[PDB]
Design a protein around this ligand. Sequence first.
Ligand SMILES: *[C@@H]1O[C@H](CO)[C@@H](O)[C@H](O)[C@H]1NC(C)=O
Lengths: 50, 40
Amino acid sequence: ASVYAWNRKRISNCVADYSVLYNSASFSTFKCYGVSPTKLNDLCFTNVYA
Amino acid sequence: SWMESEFRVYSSANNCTFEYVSQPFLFKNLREFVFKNIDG
Ligand SMILES: *[C@@H]1O[C@H](CO)[C@@H](O)[C@H](O)[C@H]1NC(C)=O
C-alpha cells in the first residue's frame, strides 16, 4: 500500500516464530521498541498486527 | 444434492475475531452438553 493509506493484517491463533524474520538476510533493517527481537520467540500477545 | 445457508441466521457479519473448525459435535440418542464461559 501507499504510505498515506497503509494496510493492516491481523494475526491470531498461531505460533509466531519471529526468529524466521529476525535472522532473514532479506531485510536492510530490523529494530524493535519495548521488546528485544531475540526474546520474541518466548513471548505471548493478545493480538499481533502487521 | 443438498444446500445449506447461514444467511437465514444472520444478514451480515463483520470484525471477526475467532474461527475454529472441527468434527461435528452432534431407541433414540440422547445428547447432553454443558456450556461454561470462564475467564474468556
Ligand atoms: C473489532 O473488535 C475488537 C474487540 O472488540 C475491537 O477492539 C476493534 O476495534 C473492532 N474493530 C472494528 C473495526 O470495529
